[PDB]
Amino acid sequence: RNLRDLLAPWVPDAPSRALREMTLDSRVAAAGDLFVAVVGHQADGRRYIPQAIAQGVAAIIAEAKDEATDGEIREMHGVPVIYLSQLNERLSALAGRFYHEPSDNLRLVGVTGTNGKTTTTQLLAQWSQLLGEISAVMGTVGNGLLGKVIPGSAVDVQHELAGLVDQGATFCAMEVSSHGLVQHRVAALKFAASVFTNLSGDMEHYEAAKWLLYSEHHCGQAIINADDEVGRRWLAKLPDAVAVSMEDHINPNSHGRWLKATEVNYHDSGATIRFSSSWGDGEIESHLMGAFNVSNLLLALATLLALGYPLADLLKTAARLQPVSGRMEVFTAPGKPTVVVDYAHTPDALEKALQAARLHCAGKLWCVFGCGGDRDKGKRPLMGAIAEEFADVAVVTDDNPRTEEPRAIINDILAGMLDAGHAKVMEGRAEAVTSAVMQAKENDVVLVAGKGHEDYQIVGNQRLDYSDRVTVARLLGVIA
Ligand SMILES: *[Se]c1ccccc1C(=O)Nc1ccccc1
């Protein structure tokens, strides 16, 4: 890494200087580093130029605004300081060149939208790896190669993608928030494809701001959920975008690329998805639960078909796709009730989990749950009301009561119900889960909500060893 080579596209005849790491933070700027002095909200990195110089940085790139002309080369204590206009917008490009353009050295797929970014990125990474990629994710669960995901500026994004390239990643599925795009954190990334899941005078400015940003980015092939009203607005302006539907929103008059589920059977162990597309037709056995996860799966499928993965190979590997751990994770055993373990610990997440479980449920829907102690009590009656409405049998139990009287939490939950007397209450959580699993019929579904993969139960100050997944697996005679 050399300052002169790094700046060649923008500053001819910048000085020759070996560089170590690139940093926005004067505090971690070490000998041989490139310090980048940016203006943010209130913060001005140009204040820290003397400190960075004293810590032995090789060179500094600084915001030009009010200070210097674009491309102006100064020399301070023998350290080159080069000024650039609009440094915040150009940070992604500068870091991309610093880190040897990692988005040109693997297949990068971005996913944006309110919901389904995590699931859709995990399905892209899993499916591509099943077809022979070495796949990675960058998202809210963290970054890394599949199975080794460890829990953020334009530089950090480029640096982390470069670290995955260095680890041998050939495919990366990246969550991209609306806020991420606006703050120029992915401005210079070359996406092979980008995915739109959903959105949940004003409408004119919003569209105009997003169209402007999009026109500036390198998003590759567009894959868009045509069941979303805003998604259809976007498709109307993007004739080469792939339209994806499970609710009959493909308009075949367009002669564009498309994929649509013609039939979905939600059964006790997942979903049978029959689909047609401009690549051909097929039947997928998904091990994921609910309508939203059909959509997320169809977006991943359309994306990988669009990038040229063969339909026959995608169909052959679909049954190996796994749920995101602790997210609508289904446990079935021969002639036992279906059990779903989900992390839902809010009124909205619990209602969505119950509505998703209900589709797979021929019999009674059971809901085992509780609420955290020594935290906001507001959600408790609202979660009671949700369990009473959207489940057939509500089993109210403990979930991390901490130092609060466990029964007091249960009382606050029951107070939200029309008929508290209809609720079942059982303390010990292990006991309550057992009661549901052992009483439920073969065609029932038991939702165990609130913990997902969070394998402890906090009682007083003790983090007790406890897993919903292990409890359920042992009762069903299967392996968590
Ligand atoms: Se641009 C980009 C880059 C990464 C991830 C997502 C996007 C994006 O905005 N994609 C998109 C939005 C709406 C319609 C099609 C595609």
Swiss-Prot record:
A single BP term in Gene Ontology: regulation of cell shape
Q: Where this protein primarily resides, as one coarse class?
A: cytoplasm
Residues recorded as binding ATP, renumbered to this chain, are: G113, T114, N115, G116, K117, T118, T119
Residue positions binding UDP-N-acetyl-alpha-D-muramoyl-L-alanyl-D-glutamate? L24, S26, H41, Q42, A43, S177, Q183, R185
Presence of keyword Magnesium? yes
Q: How does activity depend on pH?
A: Optimum pH is about 8.
Give, as in the UniProt entry, the pathway in which the protein acts: Cell wall biogenesis; peptidoglycan biosynthesis
Q: Which residue ranges traverse the bilayer?
A: none
A GO CC annotation recorded here is: cytosol
Q: SUPFAM superfamilies, from UniProt? A: MurD-like peptide ligases, catalytic domain, MurD-like peptide ligases, peptide-binding domain, MurE/MurF N-terminal domain
Motif window: Meso-diaminopimelate recognition motif:
399-402
Compartment annotation: Cytoplasm
Q: Which residues carry this modification: N6-carboxylysine?
A: K210
E.C. designation(s): 6.3.2.13
Q: Which UniProt keywords apply?
A: ATP-binding, Cell cycle, Cell division, Cell shape, Cell wall biogenesis/degradation, Cytoplasm, Ligase, Magnesium, Nucleotide-binding, Peptidoglycan synthesis
Cross-referenced InterPro entries, in alphabetical order?
A: Mur-like_cat_sf, Mur_ligase_C, Mur_ligase_C_dom_sf, Mur_ligase_cen, Mur_ligase_N, MurE/MurF_N, UDP-N-AcMur-Glu-dNH2Pim_ligase
The source's domain of life comes to: Bacteria
Q: How is it modified after translation?
A: Carboxylation is probably crucial for Mg(2+) binding and, consequently, for the gamma-phosphate positioning of ATP.
* Enzymatic reactions: UDP-N-acetyl-alpha-D-muramoyl-L-alanyl-D-glutamate + meso-2,6-diaminopimelate + ATP = UDP-N-acetyl-alpha-D-muramoyl-L-alanyl-gamma-D-glutamyl-meso-2,6-diaminopimelate + ADP + phosphate + H(+)
Q: Does the keyword Cytoplasm apply?
A: yes
Regulation (activators, inhibitors): Activated by potassium phosphate.
Molecular functions per Gene Ontology: ATP binding; magnesium ion binding; UDP-N-acetylmuramoylalanyl-D-glutamate-2,6-diaminopimelate ligase activity
Role according to the record: Catalyzes the addition of meso-diaminopimelic acid to the nucleotide precursor UDP-N-acetylmuramoyl-L-alanyl-D-glutamate (UMAG) in the biosynthesis of bacterial cell-wall peptidoglycan. Is also able to use many meso-diaminopimelate analogs as substrates, although much less efficiently, but not L-lysine.
The record ties this protein, via NCBIfam families, to:
murE, PRK00139.1-1, PRK00139.1-2, PRK00139.1-4
Matches recorded under HAMAP family: MurE
Query: Can you name this protein?
Result: UDP-N-acetylmuramoyl-L-alanyl-D-glutamate--2,6-diaminopimelate ligase
